[PDB]
């Protein structure tokens, strides 16, 4: 088409981006909490039946050995965005033989979202991303928005009850947390809105520390759930 489908409304707002935000807010809950020694990205991975093999489509995906990424919104849009983020990280490594800094990766994913907001025949991505990373010797948690705007967060939540999750994180969160404690906080925040018994499979969590980002296995998530019950 070549004509942008995201245009300013008579009130100076991009209604297309607002509707993408609504689609995101209608997505599955997800929480990201950065501790003193790492970050945790937890998310609701509830299926609609036990037929769904909850081991093939992963809600939390790694993009580099020190960067992981979870989302809230459209699964297919998340897939394309994670693929693009992986490609951007590989290009950065190839140019500079050094793992891409988390800030740069979120910047480039945000640029991709912005150019899909601006381009002609396309639609804004209906996902909000929650990149986590351990570049340098510091943990980074970034939220990237369908508008292409990225915010650094100490801890945040996005999904169905994201306002309630953010209030809960404000009450429960402190700068002195430690990774195994931030995991507890993240699972507790997810439980704050979870509708039903929280099994070790219908939830997914991924940590990111000095060793590198890794998606906790259902066994470890089960142990955390048992400690949190």
């Amino acid at each position: 088409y070549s004509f942008s489908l995201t245009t300013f409304s008579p009130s100076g707002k991009l209604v297309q981006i607002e509707y993408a935000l609504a689609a995101v807010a209608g997505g599955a809950p997800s929480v990201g909490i950065k501790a003193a020694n790492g970050v945790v990205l937890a998310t609701e991975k509830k299926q609609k039946s036990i037929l769904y093999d909850e081991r093939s489509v992963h809600k939390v995906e790694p993009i580099t050995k020190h960067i992981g990424l979870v989302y809230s919104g459209m699964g297919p849009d998340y897939r394309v965005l994670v693929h693009r983020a992986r490609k951007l990280a590989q290009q950065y490594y190839l140019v500079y033989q050094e793992p891409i800094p988390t800030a740069q990766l979120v910047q480039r994913v945000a640029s991709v979202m912005q150019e899909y907001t601006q381009s002609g025949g396309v639609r804004p991505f209906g996902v909000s991303l929650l990149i986590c990373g351990w570049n340098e010797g510091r943990p980074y948690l970034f939220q990237s928005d369908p508008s292409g705007a990225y915010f650094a967060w100490k801890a945040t939540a996005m999904g169905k009850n994201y306002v309630n999750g953010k209030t809960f994180l404000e009450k429960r969160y402190n700068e002195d947390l430690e990774l195994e404690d931030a995991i507890h906080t993240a699972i507790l925040t997810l439980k704050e809105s979870f509708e039903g018994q929280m099994t070790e499979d219908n939830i997914e969590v991924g940590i990111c520390n000095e060793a590198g980002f890794r998606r906790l296995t259902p066994t470890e998530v089960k142990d955390y759930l048992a400690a949190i019950a």
């Binding site: 009450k171 429960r172 947390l177 195994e180 404690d181 507890h184 400690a227």
Partner: protein, 202 residues
């Protein structure tokens, strides 16, 4: 691995027939892979909980704590809480309970766990009240209240305020037990108050 499983079903059969042999085999397994050891610790702790023996299981805590935390699962708070709750549902007033709880709390402090530490401190004030150490119960409860007020959960808060109310009812008459009970009721009015907590309040 295969030998571990074989001896696990051997312990199950001896649980069915004569529990003592199974319990001894579980101790043998523990003395003797990390999954096998932790699992066997779990079953033998449950068995001691069922049989009512307390000194042996306290010695088990003392023994495991170092190896428990070192071998694997820095989230070993799982096992620590499990064994403490086995004690404390097998309440026996053996005296060693307070020392075990304090040791577990110090281990949690070293591990930097905070909610585990706070839950253990709450049930520790419960133990102090049950063992009549009212002054220590009051001090620890006040510290725990000051922590849980800033870290807002309101549930352990209501529990701790109820324990403080009972302690004041036992010791300092009822110009302070009434105030603590009022604080507990007000804090509980802002949360669901699961049936156990609501019945304790009432």
């Amino acid at each position: 691995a295969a030998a571990a499983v074989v001896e696990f079903q051997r312990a199950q059969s001896l649980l069915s027939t004569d529990r003592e042999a199974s319990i001894d085999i579980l101790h043998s397994i523990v003395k003797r892979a990390v999954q096998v050891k932790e699992q066997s610790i779990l079953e033998l702790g449950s068995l001691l909980a069922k049989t009512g023996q307390a000194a042996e299981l306290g010695g088990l805590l003392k023994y495991v704590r170092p190896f428990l935390n070192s071998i694997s699962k820095a989230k070993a708070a799982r096992l620590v809480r499990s064994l403490l709750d086995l004690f404390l549902d097998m309440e026996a007033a053996t005296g060693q309970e307070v020392e075990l709880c304090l040791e577990c709390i110090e281990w949690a402090k070293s591990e930097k766990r905070t909610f585990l530490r706070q839950a253990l401190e709450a049930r520790l004030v419960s133990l102090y009240f049950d063992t009549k150490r009212y002054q220590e119960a009051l001090h620890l409860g006040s510290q725990l209240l000051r922590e849980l007020k800033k870290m807002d959960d309101k549930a352990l808060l209501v529990e701790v305020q109820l324990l403080e109310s009972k302690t004041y009812h036992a010791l300092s008459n009822l110009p302070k037990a009434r105030a603590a009970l009022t604080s507990a009721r007000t804090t509980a009015n802002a949360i669901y108050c699961p049936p156990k907590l609501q019945a304790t309040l009432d």
